[PDB]
Every structure is written in C-alpha cells, then in structure tokens.
C-alpha cells in the first residue's frame, strides 16, 4: 500500500486550503478580499501547507495571476522560497508558472530576481512508472518539454545555463528525447543547439554522457524514439555528388559501430527489455550495416562454425552408442519376470583396441565441453552450458565408475541435438524457426499446460480407482498410480490405443468415464489449435523480416563478444587516408523514388 | 396466436372510418364537407370507433389541423374524452397531437383547458418486446422522447408536473435513458433538470427509485446506455488542480461502491441478461475501481483461498486411492472367465493404525463438504455443489456399508479436479480459459453433438448386424449391441485401432461399410475445426480483455457476498476527515493526450 500514502497526503492539501482564510482567498481571484485580509491585519507569510505550500504557489498553481501580483508587495522573499518535502522538494514558484505554459508571471518573477538554478529534487519529478511525467529538474527543462518557445529564450536572456544535469545526469537534451510526444517537441532540439555559442573545450553539449554513459544520440536508439533518431542522423551524413536520380550519400558510422568498448549501439539495442527499440533497425544507415556485416564476414564464419558443431555431435553419438557392455554375468533376475535387463555396464575395460578409437573419441567430446565452459567463465546460452555440464557429469560418473550413468547420457544427447537448431536460421533464410518456438514456449504453452495437467490428473487418478478391482494381467495400463498418470498421458495426446480387452468384461464405470475423457481430449487439444491461430500467428508476415533482423544482429553481437581480431576487420571504409579524419564511413547509393 | 388479435382489430378500425360519413370526412381535410355535415343536421359526437375513436382523435391522428379546429365548435367536451379499451386506454387527444412532433394544436387544445395529467394505461404503451416503442404514460414524457423542445416547455407553462410516474414507477428521466436514440435525446436530460426549481425535501428528482428501486443513474448502467452513462458521471466528479498536462480529478464513488445492501452497481451489471451492459466497465471511474479492487485485497485473498482448495483435493485423493480392500475371499468366479474382479471392498475394517490417518483424512474431506453446503443453504456454483453432494453420498454409502461405492468415488474425483480450473484465471493472467470453454460448451458443441450422435448410432448398429454372424472370439469389438456403440465411439474420435484380424476372413459388407465410416469420420471431425474457426474465434482479440474484465468482477462480486468485514475494508478514501462529507472518493491522475 505505497501509493495510498500519496493520495491521502494530496487530499490533505485540499483540506488546508479549504479551512485557512489566506489560502482560500488566494485560490479564487478575489483581489478585493485579499486587500483587507493582508494589508490591514498581520498575517504571517510563512503559512506552510500540507506539503509545504506558500501563498505564492497557490496563486501560481490555480493559474491566478491577479492574486499573485498583489502578493508581490507582501512577499519579497517567497519567490525564493522552495516547497518543503518528500514529493515536492525545492520546486520554486518559478517552475509552477512555467508548467501552465505561461502566466506572464515569469516576466514578473524574474523582475523579482528569481533563481533559475534551483533543483526540484522531489520524488514526483524523478523517473519512475509511478509518476505520469518525467520533466527533469532545472526550470529550463520544464520550459522545454511543454513546447513553449519564447518562455525558453526568455530564460536564456536572464542567465539560464544549458548544461546542468539532474540526479541521473541527463541534460536538457536528453529529456526532449524521452518525451511522450515526439515530433511536437522535435523542434526544440534544433532550437537549443542554436544556443551552443559558448563552445566548451570538453564537448559541444551533443556528446554529454549521463551517469550510465549515454550520449543523447544513443538514448534515442535505446528508447525507440524513431522520429527523433532520423533527425539526429541528418547532421552526421555527408552528401557527395547528385547524379540525376542517383544520390551518393555517406553515413558517418562512429557512434553505431562496434569500435570501442562503449558497446556503442548494436549491443545496446538487443540487451534492452523495450521491444519497440527493435524498430530502429529499419532505418537506413543501420540496415545497410547489419546486412553487410552478415553477407560479408558474418555468414561464412558462422556456417564454418556450424559444421564443426555438427561434426562434434556425430563424434559424440559414435562414442555413445558404443558403450562398454558386458553380458549380465552377475545376479539373476530375482523378482519374478518383472526386472528384465541384461548389460550392467562394465567397470574398467579398455582393452580390445577398437576401444583405443573410443578413448580418443571420448576425449574429443570432453575437451570441447571444457572449451564451451571456458568461453562462459564470466535462450540458447542456457543449453550450450547445460549440454557441456552434463558431459562433465559423465566423465565424473565414468571415472568414479558408478552405476546410474544413462541419465547423464540421455540429457547429453537430447540437449546436444536440439542445440543444432540454433544453427539452422544461420545456415539459410528459413523464416526464423527456433525463436518462433520461443515466442510460444513461454507465452501460451505455459498457460495451456495448466489446462492439460488438471484434467489428466483427474481421469488418471479416476481410472486407478476403477481398475483397483481388476486383475492387472489384463489391461496392464493401470497396475499402479505412478504409471496410471503416464498411461493417460499417451491417450490425451492420442498415441496409445486406448485400453480394451474384448474377452474379459471391463467394469461399468469405465465406458461412461472413458467417453468423458475422449470427448474432452478432442476438445482441449482441438481448442489449442485456436490459441495458436490468433495469438501467435497474429500479423507475423509484417514482423517476419524484423524477427529475421533482430536474430541476425544477436548472432553478430555474440560473435564479436567471442572472437578476437586480426581475422575480423570491422566494416566500413577507414578514414585518415582519404583525409576525412579518424571516423570510418560507408557509402550508400539510392534512387529518388 | 396472440398477435393476430391485435391486427384483426386494427383493420377493424380502418373499416369504421371507411363506412361512416363523419369519420371519413374527418380523415381528409374536407372542411367544406364538414360544414354541411355537422352544423345542419344532428350528428352525435359520441361516435366511437373500433377501438373507441372520437372525431377529434382522427383529425389529430391523420395530422389534419384544419378539420380539428372546425371540430372545436361542435365538441367542447371531446378534448377531455379518453380512448376506450385494451390497447389505447385513456390516451387523450392531447397525446396524439404531441406524437406527430407538433400540430400547433397543443396550443389550441390547452386553450380548451385540456388535462395534462391523464394516464395512457393501455397495453400498447407498456414496456414489452411486442410494442416497438416505450414512451411511458404522461404527456410530458411523450414530448420528451420525440425531441421537441418548445413543446416540452409549453407544457411546463401550463402546469405539467415533472415527477409523475408510470405503472413501473419510472420518472420522465428514466424514459429518456431507455430511448433507442441516445445522443439525440441526451440534451433533454440537461433541460429537464433546469426545471427542478421547486426543490423537494425527499429527493431532487435525480435520486427517485422505480418500483424495483433503481435510480436513473443505475438504470443507465444496467441498460448499457454508454453515452448517457458518461454524461451522468460529469456532475459527480469534482476536479482538483490542473498542472500542465496533468489533471487530478476525483470521482464520487457513492452509487457504484458495494457499500449498502442496495447491491448498487457492480452486482447489477453481471446479473443481467443483456450482454452490452458489460461495455460499461470500459469507462474510467469503474475501470480504475475494479483493478484496484483486484490488485489490492482482491488477488492475494483469492490465491490463498485457491491453494487451500488444492490441498483439499490432494487430501481427498490420498484417502481415495487407499481404500479398504480385502482380497476376494468370497464366492469364486461363477461365470466362465468373464467376471474377473478381486477386491470386493471390506465391510467394517478400521484396524492397522495406518487407517487412523485415513480416518482423520476422511473427516477432513467430509467436514469441508458441509462447509461448502453451508455457504449455499440460501457455471461453477453448480459443480461446487455437486462435488460436495457426491461426497455426502460416499459417507452415506460407507456408513450403511453397501456395495456400489465406486460410482460416488468416480464423480467425486473428476468434478473435484476440473473444479480447480476455476482458480486458474485467478492465479495469473492467462487469457481466460474455463469461460472460453463455456462459450462453446453450449453454443456449438450442443449443436455438433447432434451430428456425431446420428452417424454413430447408424454404423455401430450397422456393424452389429454384419458381425451378428461371426464368432466374437475374434473381433470382440462387437459381441453385443451395448458395446457396439461404445466401440464405434472410439473409432469416430480415432482412438482404437480399427478392427482387423488378417488371419480369419471378415464378411464382405465390412470393407465397404467401414470405408464409408472412415471417410465420414475424417470429414465431420474435420469440418468441426471450421465451426470453431469462424464462430468462436471471431474477433476475440477485441473482447479478450473485456472477457478478462467481466470474469474478474464476478470473482470480486461473489467474494463479497461470501466474506465478512473487519478484514475487508472497502476501496477508496473515506470522507468526513477531509471535510468532504460522508461520500467516499478515489482520485485519478491522467495526461491530456
């Protein structure tokens, strides 16, 4: 109940105005009532509200100009006076006059030498999903986001600095990208760059990092602000000749390359949670990059890496289906014909020099498993690891030479083979599988496997009741409750033949109960076809080539985290030879159409 | 044949006008013919039509002004004269002049001191699906629904009361909500509140109940009048400060809370039959309420209640799969190898102190069943009950210690387990199942299970004919007609393997007949996939979050019917401390966008 403490405090504000004569006459524009109340008697100007209001704030907050100008004579010092605590901290009355788009009071308050450097450090202004707005701190930034142009430039004409930062370190630029309305505040980004006249030696305000090291350009990438992203690109491209319908531009490629350890852009696109930042890749200087990082140097270094994994698993199965295997010379089948097994898995046999090949082939798998883990000492990284983690269990299980060694070899074989499906979409254009399964291995399957697990726990338990009476030498589906669940599971997916004997009479609860399992099984498994008809299929032809863009990048990003240079030159033409400088470019031709 | 008695009587009206000289000359505007017919001879003015017409009504009804003004001299008293019986009762001629939007006769009739308090109590004006209109009774209300403004205020200027009621007790306000055209009559609700000048001590006309206790506000909720519902909300919200793009309103929450035993709104939304009243929940002061009734105090009191049911059924299965069970020491298998069973279910054994745990565990189930029924001494309430009703059969079956005790234990196990699917959509967001099954367990399944039952009753009966000849020791699918239906039922849903022997020759009608069952089974079960492709799927992505709004309310409504206070405070901020009064509010911030 955190949010209730806000709302109880906000009605408490409305209680204080409603009962005090100074604040209530300030609420309405009763100038004549504010005459007799103020100049005649002694009223303290320090009347603090429920959240530390002043009389001057309430005249500003309920957009009351004529009351506030009368309050100027009585209050020479409440213009400087901040607001008190825990939601509004340091919010001076200059801010409130700005937020209501104008009052012509900013002209009046700055005539009263108002401070333009006060920081509203309250909780209600910090970035959070609890507040419905994020305007930053400094009163220049409040005039920025409301899209009031002349109110901005009036503040510059009284000494408002353009480079102050909030607690998160954001500039006045960074707040303009984070606005909920994009193009209506896009013109401010051009306007505030025109006041960059005092060129500082550090950076000319367009390269300022926050406390997590983000330029205003890269923040437009991460927060999915597409319309602003195209506009910030415009100052970096450098156009060469125009030739009829041809145009040979030259994009900059400095803050978007994987050059330094700033992780500059392409890593920061995929690592976010926000899904609409994958829309950024449709823009033209990025789309040309990731394709040319793929067709050249990207794809054949992957497919060569893919075949070695395929020869890895083949070399594992060969040293898997050949397993030591004496005939069972030890203890005979002591339970009555219900304990059949005949191999018992040899102890320390390595003779018969066919096993010399296996002992080589055993090491080829195990060494590659350590090679997997040494890459991962600091959706598919989970089962790259748990493949090789199970293989280390095997060599531990074999060198201690214990008994239950199949349960490593099982999980080291399924997780090994399904892992090669990750290399499928790398091999060819295939309309990406192995991720489209991961869109619905979480979204609908984990919701539907509730619905199968409930019914299948009933009827399996119900069949064990009605075949509790029977001789299990006929209809051995149900000799015990541990297999009665597994037996019914083959019928709900319709695999096993459904129990019937036709020579021995089955009990009369079965025929009714089994029908009420049959008709449900051809409903819920039939209704499952609709949940992946509308939800998963929804409009995926629109997002197929984007899902086949985001997956290609994440392959390229992971491959440059895990591969040294001198065999991977970064894409684009180097500078410094053509006299353009240190920044490396690339060029794109197009037709005007 | 009730409706035919109306229509035969209405042509009988047209017969009477067509044959009488007074009425037929009244029908057309033949003033010159009405001169010689009336002033010269003696004509009775009491000529009653087939439904008791007067001459003055027919001049009004066939929109004939000039005839009616000539009729004023001959008829000083027919203005007061009502219409006779069974469809039109007391419908004075003032009403008919109003219904045709005007005649300038209302000015003429009220010059003849016409009564404005006569009640048209006929069958044709009472609310019913038989009549195509519902205008109420009093002639003010007829001027209301036709959207004739000055005709309304002319009636107030001659003494028309604003608070008379019909037989259902509806006001002149309540009829305006029930209109088929909504926004075209919405302005009348503002206009008639302006004539509330005589402020009565009882209620100021906006709080008047009908005979079933409905305010005009709650009737706009129940009858799905969405556009009117937003407009009646406007006088109850109480706006606090505005702050740039922020707006902190404060909705009233008195007639929509579950406060009194008026069942005020949220119970009355879900209990109706009318489906378009679930559209009301999309409006903003209700949508904020039901979410905050859910996330706070609603969901974790449900999930805690959900796990105790899950531990209930687990504690039932444990005292179910352990059942008394002697070996069959009584009478041997007297039929020849067709009567196999070996347990016979012990009589009065409660020794072997493992059964002390079961005898505790038996009571834990049975006491909870009485707890279920004690809640229900005054779609899922049906099988909350019939679960526990079967469990009481078990303890009756065990204490009398009869034989057939499995058929209680079966139905007490399936109905117990599938019941927990009702707790599924309470547990997480899951795109509601267990109700989407109930949209098509009635709508299409009960229509399609006709089509399977007809074919499956043919071929099952047909196979028993062609295997009447055969030795049932091979192909024991069909040894008798009671199992021949059940055997074919496993093939039409394709579960059992389909009968074949390959060593004994099967009769030559089978191979043809069985194919004509196979190809139909892969058609009707295939065509069933289309009936739940278009009908059930239809546009459910639009109505998913509404079906996941109506189901959440019905959980919240049921939970407050069945849980005492001192652990459930009702939502919203209390009044009376902030000086707002007794009405409890809640506040909502939003952005203007």
UniProtKB/Swiss-Prot annotation, chains A, B:
Ligand binding (Ca(2+)): 497
Membrane side Extracellular: residue ranges: 322-358, 399-404, 468-480, 501-511
One CC-aspect GO term: calcium channel complex
Motif extent (Selectivity filter): 496-500
PTMs per UniProt: Glycosylated.
Annotated protein name in UniProt: Transient receptor potential cation channel subfamily V member 6
Illness: Hyperparathyroidism, transient neonatal: An autosomal recessive disease characterized by impaired transplacental maternal-fetal transport of calcium, high serum PTH levels and signs of metabolic bone disease in the neonatal period. Skeletal anomalies include generalized osteopenia, narrow chest, short ribs with multiple healing fractures, and bowing or fractures of long bones. Affected individuals experience postnatal respiratory and feeding difficulties. The condition improves within a short time after birth once calcium is provided orally.
Keyword Disulfide bond: no
Catalytic reaction equation(s): Ca(2+)(in) = Ca(2+)(out)
Family the entry assigns: Belongs to the transient receptor (TC 1.A.4) family. TrpV subfamily. TRPV6 sub-subfamily.
Organism of derivation: Homo sapiens
Phosphotyrosine modification, residue list: 134
Chain positions covered by the region annotation Interaction with S100A10: 553-557
Keywords on record: ANK repeat, Calcium, Calcium channel, Calcium transport, Calmodulin-binding, Cell membrane, Disease variant, Glycoprotein, Ion channel, Ion transport, Membrane, Metal-binding, Phosphoprotein, Repeat, Transmembrane, Transmembrane helix, Transport
Keyword Metal-binding: yes
């Amino acid at each position: 109940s955190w949010a209730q403490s806000r709302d109880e405090q906000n009605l408490l504000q409305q209680k204080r105005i409603w009962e005090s004569p100074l604040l209530l006459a300030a609420k309405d524009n009763d100038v004549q009532a504010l005459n007799k109340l103020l100049k005649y008697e002694d009223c303290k100007v320090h009347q603090r509200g429920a959240m530390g209001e002043t009389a001057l704030h309430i005249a500003a907050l309920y957009d009351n100009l004529e009351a506030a100008m009368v309050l100027m004579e009585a209050a020479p010092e409440l213009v400087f006076e901040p607001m008190t605590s825990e939601l509004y901290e340091g919010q001076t009355a200059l801010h409130i006059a700005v937020v209501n788009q104008n009052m012509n009071l900013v002209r009046a308050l700055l005539a009263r030498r108002a401070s333009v450097s006060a920081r509203a450090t309250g909780t209600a202004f910090r970035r959070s999903p609890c507040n419905l707005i994020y305007f930053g701190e400094h009163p220049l930034s409040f005039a920025a986001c409301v899209n009031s142009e002349e109110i901005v430039r009036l503040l510059i004409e009284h000494g408002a600095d353009i480079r102050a930062q909030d607690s998160l370190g954001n500039t006045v630029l960074h707040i303009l990208i984070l606005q909920p309305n994009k193009t209506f505040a896009c013109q401010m980004y051009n306007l505030l760059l025109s006041y960059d006249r005092h060129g500082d030696h550090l950076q000319p305000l367009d390269l300022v990092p926050n406390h997590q090291g983000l330029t205003p350009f890269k923040l437009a990438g991460v927060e999915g602000n597409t319309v602003m992203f195209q506009h910030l690109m415009q100052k970096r491209k450098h156009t060469q000749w125009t030739y009829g319908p041809l145009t040979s531009t030259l994009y900059d490629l400095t803050e978007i390359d994987s050059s330094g350890d700033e992780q500059s852009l392409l890593e920061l696109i995929i690592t976010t949670k926000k899904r609409e930042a994958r829309q950024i890749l449709d823009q033209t200087p990025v789309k040309e990059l990731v394709s040319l990082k793929w067709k050249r140097y990207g794809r054949p270094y992957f497919c060569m890496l893919g075949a070695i994994y395929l020869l890895y698993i083949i070399c594992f199965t060969m040293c898997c289906i050949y397993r030591p295997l004496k005939p069972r010379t030890n203890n005979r089948t002591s339970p009555r014909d219900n304990t059949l097994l005949q191999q018992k898995l040899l102890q320390e046999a390595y003779m018969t020099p066919k096993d010399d090949i296996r002992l080589v082939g055993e090491l080829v798998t195990v060494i590659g498993a350590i090679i997997i883990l040494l890459v991962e000492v600091p959706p598919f990284h989970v089962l790259i690891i748990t493949y090789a983690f199970m293989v280390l269990v095997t060599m531990v299980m074999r060198l201690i030479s214990a008994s239950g060694e199949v349960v490593p070899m099982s999980f080291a074989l399924v997780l090994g083979w399904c892992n090669v499906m990750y290399f499928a979409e790398g091999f060819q254009m295939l309309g990406p599988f192995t991720i489209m399964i991961q869109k619905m291995i979480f979204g609908d399957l984990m919701r539907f496997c509730w619905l199968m697990a409930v019914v299948i726990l009933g009827f399996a338990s119900a069949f064990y009741i009605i075949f509790q009476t029977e001789d299990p030498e006929e209809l051995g589906h149900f000799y015990d409750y541990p297999m009665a669940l597994f037996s019914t599971f083959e019928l709900f997916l319709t695999i096993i033949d459904g129990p019937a004997n036709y020579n021995v009479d089955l009990p009369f609860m079965y025929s009714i109960t089994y029908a009420a399992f049959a008709i449900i099984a051809t409903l819920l498994m039939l209704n499952l076809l609709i949940a992946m008809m509308g939800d998963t299929h929804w409009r995926v032809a629109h997002e197929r080539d984007e899902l086949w863009r985001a997956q290609i990048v994440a392959t390229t990003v992971m491959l440059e985290r895990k591969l040294p240079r001198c065999l991977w030159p970064r894409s684009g033409i180097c500078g410094r030879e053509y006299g353009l400088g240190d920044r490396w470019f690339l060029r794109v031709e197009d037709r005007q159409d």
